[PDB]
Design a protein around this ligand. Structure first.
Ligand SMILES: Nc1ncnc2c1ncn2[C@@H]1O[C@H](COP(=O)(O)OP(=O)(O)O)[C@@H](O)[C@H]1O
Ligand SMILES: Nc1ncnc2c1ncn2[C@@H]1O[C@H](COP(=O)(O)OP(=O)(O)O)[C@@H](O)[C@H]1O
Ligand SMILES: Nc1ncnc2c1ncn2[C@@H]1O[C@H](COP(=O)(O)OP(=O)(O)O)[C@@H](O)[C@H]1O
Ligand SMILES: Nc1ncnc2c1ncn2[C@@H]1O[C@H](COP(=O)(O)OP(=O)(O)O)[C@@H](O)[C@H]1O
Lengths: 305, 306, 306, 305
């Protein structure tokens, strides 16, 4: 899809809630289209509407950006900002981000072409369509454990990428002027105004994300297209086992994850994956011994499990 | 074998006990087969059932994973997590794990084809769909922070791209880690599993404990498994025309020596057995060619003098 | 007051909301009274119901504890835990907390007696049975390890003797900390409560959360409580013969300014209110003596220009 | 009591299980009596049978030693060994242990005398009867976060105390030749043979302690004389509330603590204190409003709580 409301709808198929974050990337992606519709010098003066996402861990910041890029057939790279503060001879320079992105556009163009010029198209796509997700940008803006580049230095090193620079790769120079950047952080260890002024100026769009509620966990489990329940159901189908979850079993699974997030650590929706798996441990092991049968998991089964 | 109960049975041929750990890797391996039966988009949405093994040292964490990979003809790489906290210019980046794995899948595909650009293409296919990566002492890179290189949390952060899904460059071409299985292990005395990065927890769906080995476990480790130390020394002395025999009380005596050393010096698990049988066999290992055709019996008394 | 519901009601006079936190300190204080009703050995086996408060900054953690201590005529000491991680030769040891507490109990007993070796003896008695110690940012000394003094875990380890029970030397004599109540607080974004030393967890029986303050909370904080900022500025301007008046829309406007600043710069909780009323009162605070006998009304429009 | 079997019995009133650890301190305390029964120079050649306790956290190492000393009317000091590895101008020298011990013997002699000579008796008791508990002695024997004395240096600093030295205090010199030392550690970060040889030689008795079982938690809750249940029952009696626990409620409370120790962290019996308190939160708050009544807590009440 190509329209912002259409983009929001496509993202609804995989991400529950977070409407503001969904609309922010839609605007950013739609503006890339508006730029290419422009003609003349104005085509070279408009820059990507880069985004700063603020929100707790495991509530959809990566997922929204990752699905967005797949929607737009754009090459995507996720990186943890603090990795550039560590010593190391391999992969400690931020231009590795751009080199990896071309490496992802090559393997992306090969898939579409099948269905020298290919390498050129990977270099064309990377410049005009690349999407870069920089996680925990809040951690490189704090009051200063890494013995490498300082935190402000990682910010200073990010400036050439998001302002516009040329980067050398094993396939040739890559310009970053019109690559879209999505940055994210919780901003408990720092605040958004602790970013370098030059970085603030290259983050036009600011959007918050909210904690997931108990109802959010229920819908995340069942409603989205690649949901965990649909995965476990699909995996047991290959063993000739029709797996069924009652509605109270789904409520019970969501409650286990909410409670653990409330007593151990709130890791957001990442808790769901580990909770369903232990409840399905007995049936995942014995599934070939149960072929042809229909297995219904109720609230009581989740309780004993 | 391809079935979880069948996998557990194959592992019983080499590992004593640790039934929960055996069933955990079976589930993880069986899900790889369940995934490839899927067709469509769901084939690209299911991720490996990575495992966190919790247990003391030398009770079968590496051995289970290593036998599992050989059972599945899958390329296998074991790595010590804390090695990435040290300074150095060779092999200090976690992508070295993935490069080594292709290096092991290439040499694996050549063996089966014989019994080539196309071989390298499948070695890149095998590595992506069948690779198994064992990360030891993942508990030590989650502690309260001697390595002067990457910090402990930084080694975790560097592991995130591998287990979440990334493309890695090699001397043979780009490799995706999306469908590689990861088995991680630690004792978790210096830290706890919730000290791992949240992003890491979410990519470790299966959690399994392992237990200390008991005195009876040592006796069965010595004799019952297919590649047991006793069966090795017997086979080694057969090449010298010497029938090496252990009485049943001798095996008990050897197990008791190892338990006591693990109880008074340090508990290193079943690794103590190797050094204990070897010192008792010192006299015969030296003189065996001078003793050809003869039968050498090690009893409880011989273990005592040894 | 002496009853938990009565304690909650007394705290309602100064703190808006945070009902769970109010009831938590009530239980802890009521158990002190329950203990002294006991006679015999059980009188020496019951230990204070120490509290861990979890909540964002500036929502009432210090204020609740501080009002509680004044309600109970108990000596009170607030300390920043991370101060003990810094180098220095004055006041860098945790026993300084206890020495300061006696210093506050002495000056407390003198006030009540007037309205002396015997005073110091009871100040040493009061400190032991009635002292209240508030330790802020106990979450920061439980993180992954800028202070060049004691390490973070070391500050925890140094706190163990205080909350488990120890004798501390002072310029007035030995003081036991066995029956001192401890209230600890943190946001727990940089760490989690299970990152505390096991020995510390066991001496924190009561766990209570506090919530963010809402826009309506700011309005009630401004006006409803007994020592509210509005009642302070009104009283301060009364000494100049100026009737200071706030309309209800003006109070909403002031609360909105603070919410927006907490939403765009940094969320510092109710601390934002103090700086916001002060800038709106800048014009009148200066000219009030030149305006004696007059009435000054601050409306929504006046807050807008200000 | 004065006999080792009698000592073991007195400790049974407060500590569940750990029979080996109980007998080890009994031997050590009984030998102090055997020494004072000796006459002549042999009286000056026998040294305390110091103990190294090995065991997990929160299973009774401190409690056994603390109760033992109270049984013997002996002044007692507990210290965390790693505290001497930290920088600091106050209380970072191991002789503070001995100075604190005299400070505890003074306040101990005043209690018994009531029921210059007193200070002399505090100096007499400290030398002949002091008991020093050094916790986590395993942590100062590891492979080397404190920026002060090194770990081996803390061991080296402990040598004068346990071999025999004179220590100056605000009341006068204190000899440590016949002070009993109980040291403890889990020995996962190191092993007992990592201690300095001179320290090994001054730790004659070696005793292990075991993890607490589910049944241990049940007996710890109810059976011992100062148990948590008897405290909460006694505290509610001062409010005219007869609090009663069913047997299944006690089982339920023990199960909550075992599960948390199995999923968060095994902190031993320290988990019990925090678990009963949250279950009693509603009644502890409302107890004055319920005076004259009898309140029975069953398994179902522990479940909702
Ligand atoms: N709102 C949500 N809707 C659907 N899935 C979600 C949501 N929030 C988190 N998830 C899932 O939880 C996991 C972690 O989420 P992710 O977006 O990567 O985290 P973060 O916000 O920390 O980047 C992924 O499997 C993701 O699909
Ligand atoms: N349960 C067991 N059954 C059989 N052999 C075992 C067992 N535990 C340990 N061993 C043997 O002891 C040695 C060390 O075991 P290993 O699994 O590699 O240790 P770790 O669990 O620390 O990874 C190997 O020779 C292994 O075969
Ligand atoms: N809920 C509240 N009710 C009343 N005053 C409050 C509330 N929260 C904060 N305040 C006021 O805001 C300031 C800071 O609050 P305080 O409790 O000291 O912060 P913290 O919770 O960080 O300890 C004080 O002036 C306090 O009176
Ligand atoms: N076996 C036990 N019997 C009775 N109480 C115990 C036992 N183990 C631990 N406790 C209690 O748990 C808490 C911590 O125990 P403690 O002996 O101080 O720990 P450690 O072994 O770490 O020194 C104390 O309240 C203690 O009374």
């Amino acid at each position: 899809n190509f329209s912002p409301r259409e983009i929001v709808s496509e993202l609804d198929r995989f991400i529950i809630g977070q409407k503001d974050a969904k609309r922010a990337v839609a605007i950013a992606l739609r503006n890339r289209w508006r730029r290419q519709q422009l003609e003349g010098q104005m085509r070279e003066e408009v820059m990507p509407k880069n985004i700063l996402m603020i929100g707790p861990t495991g509530v959809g910041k990566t997922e929204i950006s990752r699905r967005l890029a797949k929607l737009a057939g754009a090459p995507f790279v996720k990186v943890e900002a603090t990795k550039f503060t560590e010593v190391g001879y391999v992969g400690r320079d931020v231009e590795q981000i751009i080199r990896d992105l071309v490496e992802i556009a090559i393997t992306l163009v090969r898939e579409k072409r099948r269905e020298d010029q290919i390498v050129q198209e990977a270099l064309r796509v990377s410049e005009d369509e690349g999407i870069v997700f920089i996680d925990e940008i809040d951690k490189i803006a704090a009051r200063e454990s890494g013995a490498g580049v300082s935190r402000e230095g990682v910010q200073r090193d990010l400036l050439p990428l998001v302002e516009g620079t040329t980067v050398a790769t094993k396939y040739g120079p890559v310009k970053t002027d019109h690559i879209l950047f999505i940055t994210s952080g919780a901003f408990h260890v720092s605040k958004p105004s602790d970013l370098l002024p030059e970085l603030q100026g290259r983050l036009p769009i600011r959007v918050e994300l909210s904690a997931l509620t108990r109802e959010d966990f229920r819908r995340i489990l069942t409603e989205t297209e690649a949901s965990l329940i649909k995965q476990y159901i699909a995996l047991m189908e290959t063993e000739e086992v029709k797996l069924e979850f009652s509605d109270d079993a789904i409520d019970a699974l969501a409650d286990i994850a909410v409670d653990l997030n409330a007593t151990v650590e709130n890791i957001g929706a990442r808790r769901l994956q580990t909770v369903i798996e232990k409840v399905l441990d007995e049936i995942s092991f014995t599934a070939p011994d149960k072929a042809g049968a229909t297995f219904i998991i109720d609230a009581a089964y989740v309780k004993e499990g």
